[PDB]
Amino acid sequence: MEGLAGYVYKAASEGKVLTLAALLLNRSESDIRYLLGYVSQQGGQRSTPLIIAARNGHAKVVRLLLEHYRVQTQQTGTVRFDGYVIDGATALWCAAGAGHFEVVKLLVSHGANVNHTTVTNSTPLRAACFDGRLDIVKYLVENNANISIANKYDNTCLMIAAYKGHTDVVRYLLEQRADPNAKAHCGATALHFAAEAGHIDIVKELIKWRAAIVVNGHGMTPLKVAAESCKADVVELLLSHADCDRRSRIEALELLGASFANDRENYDIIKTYHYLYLAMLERFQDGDNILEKEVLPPIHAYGNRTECRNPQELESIRQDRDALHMEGLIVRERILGADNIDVSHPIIYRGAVYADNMEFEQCIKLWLHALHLRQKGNRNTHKDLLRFAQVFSQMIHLNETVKAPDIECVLRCSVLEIEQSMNRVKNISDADVHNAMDNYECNLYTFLYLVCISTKTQCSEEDQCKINKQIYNLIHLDPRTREGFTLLHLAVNSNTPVDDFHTNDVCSFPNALVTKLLLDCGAEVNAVDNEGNSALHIIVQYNRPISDFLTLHSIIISLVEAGAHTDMTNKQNKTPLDKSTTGVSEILLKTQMKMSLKCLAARAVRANDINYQDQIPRTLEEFVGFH
Amino acid sequence: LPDLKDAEAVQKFFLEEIQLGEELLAQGEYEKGVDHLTNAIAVCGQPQQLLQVLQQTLPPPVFQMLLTKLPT
Amino acid sequence: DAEAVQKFFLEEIQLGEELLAQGEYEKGVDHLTNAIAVCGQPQQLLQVLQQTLPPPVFQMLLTKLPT
Amino acid sequence: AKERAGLSKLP
Incomplete structure (x- = not known):
């Protein structure tokens, strides 16, 4: 039965018809429907012979499945295999997402569900918009399914089509008078989503169709977003639309220059200077009734520049590449604000350019400001902490001295980010817990890398005290990995991953100095993992004992000098002396x-099952439970 | 033909006979595809129900071409 | 292996086209993603790929081409 | 590789 279900599922997936026709031959409708009801997971995704036939493209197979066989459109399957694999799929939805217009019209004439909503309540209409197949959308609209079925993010089919370049589908959909003001709670008004990939004619159509420009959820006009994403032509159209509002025009030109200053894909410095020249000229155009920049303080990261409130001083910085980058970043911060999501990335890119040009102090300052701004917005900043690890390791490799205040600040930022990361992990129970746990573990890894960098450096008394304070705060918070490792357990092992960049130069594990500093900082030395082992158990299991034996001679003498009961006898009845697996480790x-x-x-009276259940003191309960 | 077996070639060797025709349907030698198809229908246990099935699995030139060679 | 890949590249050239012909457009491209960019003439394959595949299929392979 | 190259798309 189940094997026959696999056979008919493969036959429908392939496209042959007589194979499953003979497989269903001389059978009643019960087992025939059961074979057709094979909704079991294939490739990790739920799929059905009818669904996989609609996903295939063979209109013949589904025309046999609806006419000569008894199968229903109410079914579960994939809707988008790459990155989504969301269940609750109608066969018509699968055909529309795949783009087979013949299967779509055949299922419509059959009477398939045209208003189906999945767990993310997504319509086949927005799938057809996502595929950009005009005739499928035209058939669906003529059959009058809907126009205003949006996603759980209130994501309209119009906004999905406008995100892509399907200008014909967009124009046909607005020809059905679906309003462009379908404001999603994220903040898209169908033209924000047009103004990322620069679909010039889509924005043309929306402006022609009374798009009714309005701010997003971030407080940014679509003109501001278009200037942010370095797309000049859509900036031109959005400027030539409705109210000019000269202040908005000037800030749009300034934002366009700023984004052209520090974007990886579009880096035309002369374009940046000329756009800021236009901004300054229209600023100082009329003479009187002049507009002026607000006097924001000189942010210490971008040097100490104070913008350019004069065309003359902008002319002064015409050839200065560093000054132009800093001016672009400063005016970007002024206009986009500090709370916005898109301000962080250009600062990181400029820091990357300076880091690859060995200007380490300036890029440390830039990335530190980026980390502060990201943590003010409370975003996912594990990548930035990893970036600090990389640049600090390369700084140690090139033996440039590392500023203790900067490593102190990145350490406290890492600690706070780990705090809110485990808060999110506790809050997100199982919806998106996997990548949160992975990023939390990577955060712990970056914390060890930064601690190693701190050990390899020379600091003053108060800076070392601040580093110890931050590390003690994290230890008293006691983070724990997925494998149950405590932080010291992560420090003493030999299989801790190290990033492929310059961290491999200096982040060698296990490290003596890191473990000594953690142990002196007040680490729980007797901490146990989920596997029952301890730090001594892991460190004796080192496969490279005489490769860095002195380090072992430190760590082993460290743990004995602070707790670390040498005969702990982990939960699978193995003392770490038994787990030595090395003559040197057991001798030490x-x-x-x-x-x-x-x-x-008491090893004897625990190897022999002597009852200790309230026959021994309460602390001695755990004493026996270890030993 | 597999001597019109009671229950062995009615479903096992029967499947390949269409499969030879189905490949030759995909090849384009429909006359050779009909030959492998028309032996399967003869050795099929219940082929009269497949008259409606087999009348639309084909290109329109083969709709009557297989029907003419169906008794064969 | 790379010399055996020159024959193994021909395998997705044979086997992967049915996967597109059957209807697995993404899987056929995914099966052909392992194939392309090992042959001696990717450009000679590209000029026919503009018209051997359906026009939606080829541009999707273009996305998978540098991957 | 380069840190600029390893800066990720993030778009």
């Missing part, structure tokens, strides 16, 4: 083992 442990209490005097 034997030189550091001590004649002791009912640990060696």
Whole structure:
């Protein structure tokens, strides 16, 4: 039965008809429907022979499945295989997303569901808009499914089509008088979503069709977004639309120059200077009734520049590339504000350019400001912490001295980000917990990298004190990995991943100095993992004992000097002396083992099942439970 | 033809006989495809129900061409 | 392996076209993504790929071409 | 590789 279901599912997936026709031959409708009801997961995605036939494109197979066989359009399947694989798929939806117009019109004439909503309540109409197939949309509109079925983010089919370049589909959809003011809660008014890829004729049509320009959820006009994304022609159209509002025009030109200053894809510095020249000229055009820049303080990251409130001083910085980049970033910060999402990335790119040009102090300042601005908005900043790890490791490799205040500030930012990361992990139970856990583990890894950088550097008394304060704050918070590792456990192992860039130059694990600093900082030395092992258990299991033996001779002498019961005997009844797997490690442990209490005097009475359940003191309960 | 077996070639060897025709349907030698198809229908256990099935699996020139060779 | 790839590239050239012909447009391109950019003449394959594949299929392979 | 090249698209 199940094998026959796989056979008919593969036959429908392939496209043959007589194969599953003979497989269903001489059978009643019960097992025939069961074979057609094979909704089981294939490739990790739920799929059905009718669904996979609609996903195939063979109108013949589905025309047999609806006419000569009894299958229903109410079914579960994929709607978008790349990155979405969302369930609750109608066969008509699968055909519309795949783009087979013949299958779409055949299912419509059959009477398939045209107003179906999935868990993300997405219509086949917006799938047809996503595919850009005009005739499918025309057939669906003529059959009058809907026009205003939006996603859970209130994402209209019009906005989905405007995000792509399907100008014909957009113009046909607005020909049905679907309003462009379908304001999503994210902030898209169908022209924000047009103004990323620069679909010039889509914006042309929307402006022709009374798009009714309005701010987004971030407080940015679509003209501002178009200037932010370095798309000049849509900036031209949005400027030539409705009210000019000269202040908005000037800030739009300034934003266009700013974004052209520090964007990786579009980097035309002369274009930046000329656009800022237009901005300054229209600023100082009329003479009197002049507009003026507000006096924002000189932000310490971008040097200490104070913008250009005069065309003359803008002319002065014509050839200065560094000054032009800084001016662009400063005016970008002024206009876009500090809370907006798109201000962080150009600062990171300029910092990357300076870092690859070995101007390490300036890029540290720029990236530190970027991290501050990202944590003010409370975003996903694990990549930026990793970037600090990379640049600090390269700084150590090129033996340039590392500023202790900067590493202190990035350390406290990392600590706060780990705090809110585990808060999000607790809050997000199982909806999106996997990547949150992965990023939390990567955050711990970056924390170890930064601690290693701090150890490799020379700092003053108060800076070392601040580093110790931050590290002690994290330890008292006690982060724990997915594998149950405590932070010290992560410091003592040998399989901790190290990033492919310059971290491999200096972030060698296990490290003696990192473990010593954590242990002196007040780390829980007797901490246990989910597997039951401890720090001594992991460190004796090192596969490279004499490669860096001195480091071992530190870490082993460190743990014995601070707690770390040498005969802990992990949950699978293995003392770390037994888990030594190396003569050097067991010799060092034997030189550091001590004649002791009912640990060696209780190994026998725990190997033999002696009842300790309230027959021994409460702390001695855990004492036996270890030993 | 597999001597009109009671239950062995009615479903096992029967499937390949269309499959040879279905390939030759995809090849383009429909006359060779009809030959492998018309032996399957003869050895099919219940081929009279497949008259409506087989009348639309074909290009329009083969709609009557297989029908003429169907008794063969 | 790379010399065997020159014959293994021909395998997706044979096998992957049915995957597009059957209807697995994404999987056929995904099957052909492992194939392309190992042959000696990617441009000679590209000038016919503009018209061997359906026009929606080829541009989707263009997205998968540098991947 | 370069840190600028490794800056990710983030678009």
